[PDB]
Swiss-Prot record, chain A:
Protein's organism: Yersinia pseudotuberculosis serotype I (strain IP32953)
Subcellular location: Cell outer membrane
Name of this protein: Outer membrane virulence protein YopE
Similarity section: Belongs to the YopE family.
Induction section of the entry: At 37 degrees Celsius in the absence of calcium.
Additional remarks: N-terminal is important for export, C-terminal is indispensable for virulence.
Residue numbers of the full-length protein present here: 22 to 78 of 219
Function of the molecule: Essential virulence determinant; cytotoxic effector, involved in resistance to phagocytosis.
Underlying gene: yopE
Length: 57, 117, 122
């Protein structure tokens, strides 16, 4: 019981080089683009969207 | 911020006419992508769109788009099994929004959609 | 990281009956059963957890992507791929100033449950 979760024994483990590197993963940002585009307030909703919407909303 | 105030501010930044009534699910059209904004679950602002995927892309290539970065607004590529459609989405807490949060989120979502082309 | 990360990890270790290290490294390794999981603060103010899952080759793209659909639980893990290291990566994330059940226990449990599901080979 104590020292366990998901019916499995838990223990601390020293993180390796790959884990330490993946943990700090960053991605260079992309320049702006929203301001330079045709933006409009949706006048209607697609068919596949209504179902999806009403299905999980 | 309440959902209604966030949306209203967003529309104003986008120079969009403010709806007489702000529905629970808002739809905005940016270029070719019809985006949808809503509060789900409670306290979270969810945005999503249905992109067009490339056949050539294998599972590894498609999954590569979902790796985490330093930007929590980076969108997640998924699939809606029931409807048979791919779904690209991002999400952030309503309680930590500032004036530019929803605009940034929408920008990140669309940029994510465009990349998938 | 910083004090907040240190405190969160310490609390988690207490709830897991793990001895508290004299030094808390930036990327904490916790092995839960057969799953080696990692916990770190990245970016600042966010607790990120991840593990390298075992994927079923009989699962196609649509099936794998389906696991990533949003739900009512923000701790639901995301399945992705790390091209640089060539490994599939399963991860979840939550605000450090807004921890579920004021702890990391539930986030870790949701990650391992996500891994267990993927291990399954229909």
């Amino acid at each position: 019981s104590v020292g366990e979760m998901s019916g499995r024994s838990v223990s601390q483990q020293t993180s390796d080089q790959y884990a330490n590197n993946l943990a700090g993963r960053t991605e260079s940002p992309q320049g702006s683009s929203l301001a330079s585009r045709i933006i409009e307030r949706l006048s209607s909703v697609a068919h596949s969207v209504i179902g999806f919407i009403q299905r999980m909303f | 911020y309440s959902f209604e105030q966030a949306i209203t501010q967003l529309f104003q930044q986008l120079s969009l006419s403010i709806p007489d009534t702000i529905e629970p699910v808002i739809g905005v059209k940016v270029g070719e992508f019809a985006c949808h904004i809503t509060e789900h679950p409670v306290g979270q602002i969810l945005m999503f769109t249905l992109p067009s995927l490339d056949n050539n892309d294998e599972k590894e290539t498609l999954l590569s788009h979902n790796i985490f970065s330093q930007d929590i607004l980076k969108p997640i590529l998924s699939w809606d099994e029931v409807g048979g459609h791919p779904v690209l989405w991002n999400r952030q807490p309503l309680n930590s929004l500032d004036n530019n949060s929803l605009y940034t989120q929408l920008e990140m979502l669309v940029q994510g959609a465009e990349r998938l082309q």
